[PDB]
Design a protein around this ligand. Structure first.
Ligand code: NAG
Ligand code: NAG
Lengths: 434, 49
């Protein structure tokens, strides 16, 4: 017997329901989400880190004009200097007086510590959910994990679940993200093949050990002022360190709906934003005969000290007139009230107490005990505690949020004004008759 | 829970109250002033005999 419903997305906050076949007894149904991860399909453009800006040895020849071929190495900057006359230890290095040529070479390369201190640039497409459910139908615990696509049944021993598509997934990741050491940033990195000096992604490669390193650091070779054999060069600062200087806060601190970002794989676990349609096919082994279940001949309810809040605040007493011994579920058939308990053992002619949570100052909600429905009407007080450590289990519907007496005053003034208009118009009609 | 109430300053004479909570049962509250003392802040001006 399939049953369709819509569960809130929030992890925790167990969700109650009552399934009911025409010839079978009403049966408890529990749907609760223990985990929910958003795993998007991501591809990798480039890795980046500190460059080493290694400088090879000078190529000095003594009064012969030489030029350097354009090497394919990363950020290759090469220059020739005439009129040099080098000195390293041991005196002059060229015999020939004042026409010697020095060749200065410079190129960049990943630092030795780039295996840990590297940032990986990702493009993030649309994400899909993989939510874990616990189903407590017929006091039989069933833990499962299922995708939210509407086409994937959940692997269970005797249960079939379909998770309908999300109303609106919000995708916390932007189209371009950057991952550094488990910290995820929504950064608009430049495209591969586009580099700016002193900016993020100034040096790029397909992998950490890739040969095709590419960079456009603003490196310039200068003429050696002192008569030695050093290579004087200047270069713009690494954009990796300049990005770490003002990276801002990562996605683990700046993310909507309060869900935590994890890496390997990139995912956003325990997000709470929408609603999942659940089509669940309860096996018939849990459905029991209506004759076996003790029906309730008469039931009445009262509410004592209703405190409407996020906690299970509010107690209701049910006076039942059961016929035979057994146990059968309870349920609350209002969107504003959620009952704490699932089933109740009833022998005959007794009293039970139940706990519920509401977001409305008026408690006008129908309780179904074991098949039979009776409504309960009472008043609920606002809580004294301003801040509570657990989330609300019900949502305000904006019509039950207005209290019963405030509804009475507002409807009384509106009805008095409207009836005053009606009596004015009928006096007009009576006067026009004359 | 914080209960704010008003008790007479009579020694002895137990004072009754009810602590009603929306999430718990009402509780008996007894307040008895077993003793009091009104100690002034004094200074010695002089001593004579
Ligand atoms: C950047 O680094 C400098 C050090 O040169 C430091 O003074 C500064 O606070 C950092 N952050 C910003 C936002 O400039
Ligand atoms: C629910 O509990 C009852 C009594 O504890 C037990 O007999 C029954 O097997 C449980 N339900 C199912 C569907 O197994």
């Amino acid at each position: 017997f399939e049953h369709a419903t819509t569960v809130p997305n929030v992890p925790g906050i167990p969700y109650k329901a009552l399934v009911e076949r025409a010839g079978y007894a009403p049966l408890n149904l529990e749907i609760t989400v223990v985990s929910s991860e958003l795993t998007p399909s991501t591809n990798k453009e480039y890795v980046t880190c500190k460059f080493h800006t290694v400088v090879p040895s000078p190529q000095v020849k003594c009064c012969g004009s030489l030029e350097c071929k354009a090497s394919s190495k990363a950020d290759y900057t090469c220059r020739v200097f005439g009129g040099v006359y080098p000195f390293m230890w041991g005196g002059a290095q060229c015999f020939c007086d004042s026409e010697n040529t020095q060749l200065s070479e410079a190129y960049v390369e990943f630092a030795p510590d780039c295996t840990i201190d590297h940032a990986v640039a990702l493009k993030v497409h649309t994400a899909a959910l993989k939510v874990g459910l616990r189903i407590v139908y017929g006091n039989t615990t069933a833990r499962l994990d299922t995708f939210v696509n509407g086409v994937t049944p959940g692997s269970s021993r005797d249960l079939k679940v379909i998770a309908g598509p999300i109303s609106a997934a919000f995708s916390p990741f932007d189209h371009k993200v950057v991952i550094r050491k488990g910290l995820v940033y929504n950064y608009d990195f430049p495209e591969y093949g586009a580099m700016n000096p002193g900016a993020f992604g100034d040096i790029q490669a397909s992998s950490l050990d890739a040969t095709d390193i590419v960079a456009r650091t603003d490196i310039r070779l200068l003429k050696p002022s002192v008569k030695n054999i050093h290579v004087p060069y200047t270069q713009a600062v690494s954009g990796y360190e300049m990005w770490k200087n003002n990276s801002g806060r990562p996605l683990q601190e700046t993310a909507p709906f309060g869900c935590k970002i994890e890496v390997e794989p990139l995912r956003a676990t325990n997000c709470a934003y929408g609603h999942i349609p659940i089509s669940i096919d309860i096996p018939d082994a849990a459905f029991v005969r209506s004759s076996e279940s003790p029906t309730i001949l008469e039931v009445s309810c009262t509410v004592a000290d209703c405190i409407y809040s996020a906690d299970f605040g509010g107690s209701l007493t049910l006076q039942y007139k059961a016929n035979r011994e057994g146990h059968c579920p309870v349920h609350s058939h209002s969107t504003t009230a959620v009952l704490k308990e699932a089933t109740t053992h009833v022998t005959a002619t007794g009293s039970i107490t139940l706990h519920f949570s509401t977001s409305s100052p008026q408690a006008n909600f129908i309780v179904s005990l074991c098949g039979k429905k009776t409504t309960c009407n009472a008043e609920c007080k606002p809580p004294a505690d301003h801040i509570i450590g657990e989330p609300h289990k019900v949502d305000q519907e904006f019509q039950a949020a207005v209290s019963k007496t405030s509804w009475n005053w507002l409807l009384a003034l509106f009805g008095g004004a409207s009836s005053l208009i009606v009596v004015g118009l009928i006096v007009l009609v009576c006067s026009s008759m004359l």
